[PDB]
């Protein structure tokens, strides 16, 4: 066995994979959904203007009730915003001010925090004393935490700066599962509806699907030519959208294992920060560095809506579970809700 | 509205007041990030200022509170998290002159001084540090003098032509590091020769921070 022989075998396998993908591509999403009725022009208004942050907002995640939302800013504090009454439910002071990611548990009892600090903090919201306290701290990562999502009240998956992801158990407090398949800095993570799979996109222009119970990777995608920054699972669970700095969103299917269409425009040349689908998945919302948010048609790839309410680069975006509204947070320290 | 709604509004107002108070308390502090290839002067500067992710230290000098930041432990793509440091006040870039002859263990063909110069040029040419002040620190003066007495300086700078004098070599290195900054109008470089006396270094850092604060206050008012 020689390294040159291994490189030749890998090249032959990649050639076989691309040949199979080219041969299996009997049609495309464009020519199939060309007969459906278009989506038309979509216009949304700012329903709620959430103010109170004194630094650039980086992360935001909705809850199960679709009413409370966690928001993280570089000021070093997490804020629990109420959508209807625009009130603050909880103000969690953080030990590390360099927070770039946060997550809301599906039960609404725990919250996550992470960022440039390798230690990931888990806080409890339903404490008996009535005050938010540090539930626990998770250490073991060597790079900055990029994203984190809750699977249940006892397990939580996340990704750090190093080319690996880790799923930890809350009861044990150690690395329950590790994934060292990626070759670049993992920056985006998205759980699947069935909670058995999850997609992770890294800076090496690749997103990989990993199983929670199995542990090994299933498929790999190399449709992007730039560092992938955002990823989101499709509501149906058979696809997922990815957004990188190449100003082009790409929808990859799990069963087809091939890109369908590219969501790009001429005047759009800036990077992408956050992408997600609606409740039905027909609309694809993407935050760009041009201070605007673009809502494209998932089937027609046409610009359905443009939101220019934010004055700074949109950093985080989140659609409610019921699809009633969508919140966006930019570096201007303001959260804006559209519908 | 009900009584619970009024109580929630009062709680939100109290939380907003607490946030404003914390912001006013944190605004008085001046933030200083640290940069430098390898371990040139990280430990030395940390020990002089005091007397696993990001480390932060607080210390008060001349009634001014300093927030220290170090990114020496983040072994990943810097371009993916450097934009978070857009709001910092000062950036202290430390470099060892004695590294003019030393080379990196990863590649013998590249020198440590060239890597430090490339890092400094990349930091200065960053789109997020157009107005951020940079303070250059030169470490190990005595070791550099000994190496100059033992070996010439032209071993790393073929275009250099001058006497093997510590003052001339230091001036040439300072000019070479200052010429890497293309934004001479908006970016200012504060060169200083660090020594064993930590008091002088702390005083120079305080004076530089004062000058940068004055310049920022004059620019915000539209006067400078």
């Amino acid at each position: 066995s020689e390294l040159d022989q291994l490189r030749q075998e890998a090249e032959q396998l990649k050639n076989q994979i691309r040949d199979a993908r080219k041969a299996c591509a009997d049609a495309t999403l464009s020519q199939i959904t060309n007969n459906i009725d278009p989506v038309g022009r979509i216009q949304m208004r700012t329903r709620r203007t959430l103010r109170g942050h004194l630094a650039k907002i980086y992360a935001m995640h909705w809850g199960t009730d679709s009413r409370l939302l966690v928001s993280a800013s570089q000021d070093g504090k997490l804020i629990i915003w109420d959508s209807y009454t625009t009130n603050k439910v909880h103000a969690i002071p953080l030990r590390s001010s360099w927070v770039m990611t946060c997550a809301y548990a599906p039960s609404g009892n725990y919250v996550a925090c992470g960022g440039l600090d390798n230690i990931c903090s888990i806080y409890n919201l339903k404490t008996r004393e009535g005050n938010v306290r540090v539930s626990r701290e998770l250490a073991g990562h060597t790079g900055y935490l990029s994203c984190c999502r809750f699977l249940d009240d006892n397990q939580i998956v996340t990704s750090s700066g190093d080319t690996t992801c880790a799923l930890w158990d809350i009861e044990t407090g150690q690395q329950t599962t590790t994934f060292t398949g990626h070759t670049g800095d993992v920056m985006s993570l998205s759980l699947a509806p069935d909670t058995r799979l999850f997609v992770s996109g890294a800076c090496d222009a690749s997103a990989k699907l990993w199983d929670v119970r199995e542990g090994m990777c299933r498929q790999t995608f190399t449709g992007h030519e730039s560092d992938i920054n955002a990823i989101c699972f499709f509501p149906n669970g058979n696809a997922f959208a990815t957004g990188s700095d190449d100003a082009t969103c790409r929808l990859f299917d799990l069963r087809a294992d091939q890109e369908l269409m590219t969501y790009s425009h001429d005047n759009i040349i800036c990077g992408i920060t956050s992408v997600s689908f609606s409740k039905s998945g027909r609309l694809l919302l993407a935050g760009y560095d041009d201070f605007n948010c673009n809502v494209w048609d998932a089937l027609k790839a046409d610009r359905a809506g443009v939101l220019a309410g934010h004055d700074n680069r949109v950093s985080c975006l989140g659609v409610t579970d019921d699809g009633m509204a969508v919140a966006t947070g930019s570096w201007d320290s303001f959260l804006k809700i559209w519908n | 509205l009900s009584a619970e709604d009024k109580a929630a509004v009062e709680r939100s107002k109290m939380i907003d007041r607490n946030l404003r108070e914390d912001g006013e308390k944190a605004a008085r502090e001046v933030k200083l990030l640290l940069l430098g290839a390898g371990e040139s002067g990280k430990s030395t500067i940390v020990k002089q200022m005091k007397i696993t992710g990001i480390v932060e230290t607080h210390f008060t000098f001349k009634d001014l509170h300093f927030k220290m930041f170090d990114v020496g432990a983040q072994r990943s793509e810097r371009k993916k998290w450097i934009h978070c440091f857009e709001g910092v006040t000062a950036i202290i870039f430390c470099v060892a002159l004695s590294d003019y002859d030393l080379v990196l263990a990863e590649d013998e063909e590249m020198n440590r001084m060239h890597e430090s110069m490339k890092l400094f040029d990349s930091i200065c040419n960053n789109k997020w540090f157009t107005d951020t002040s940079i303070i250059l620190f030169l470490n190990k003066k005595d070791l550099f003098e000994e190496k100059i007495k033992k070996s010439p300086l032209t071993i790393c700078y073929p275009e250099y032509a001058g006497s093997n004098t510590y003052e001339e070599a230091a001036a040439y290195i300072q000019c070479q590091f200052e010429d890497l900054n293309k934004r001479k109008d908006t970016k200012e470089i504060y060169t200083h020769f660090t020594c064993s006396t930590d008091t002088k270094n702390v005083q120079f850092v305080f004076d530089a921070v004062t000058d940068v604060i004055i310049k920022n206050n004059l620019k915000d008012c539209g006067l400078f």
Partner: single-chain antibody
Amino acid sequence: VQLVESGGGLVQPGGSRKLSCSASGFAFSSFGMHWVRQAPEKGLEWVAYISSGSGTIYYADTVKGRFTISRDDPKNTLFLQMTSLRSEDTAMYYCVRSIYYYGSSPFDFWGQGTTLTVSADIVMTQATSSVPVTPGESVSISCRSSKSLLHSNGNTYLYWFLQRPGQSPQLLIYRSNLASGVPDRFSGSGSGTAFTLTISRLEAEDVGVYYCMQHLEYPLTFGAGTKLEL
């Protein structure tokens, strides 16, 4: 958490008395404080309420001008000054904590309280006062209100309190919404006017008196309370 009350005893008519309350085990500056009085062989009655930072203070329409409530946040203490006590003010007072937010549970912990012996709005009215029940059957206490508590937001402001002889009242339901620390056997139903509290399985620890409280406005008014003997 612990709430130690002090200052009760015998007071001559026309005098003054400063009741003190020390809180521990939680953030005193985060929870709003309420005073609940209970007369011998009678029901409960709200006295006064104070919020965090003394920004919102309310008193009962009957004791306006006489009672004065204050709080020490750096010391985590509550003080209640009572002047010109009448022959009716003889009762047992309890200090209750309550926090208000989405998904909270106000009036969750009741203090021990202390006794004091001297010498148009919404009112809750219960049809029954004592229902004999044997172990094995179910319990269903009905209640009727004079005003529809169904506010425009859609939240039902109804609180159930189970007081046991010798112990402090325990919160069962704060809003259908089951509270923490209580079994799932208790349930609440009904419309905005009529309410019904049902018990799945009646155990030996569920005996006591049930009181209903409304929280649509600041002036509170407890019901008659249904007592269960077993």
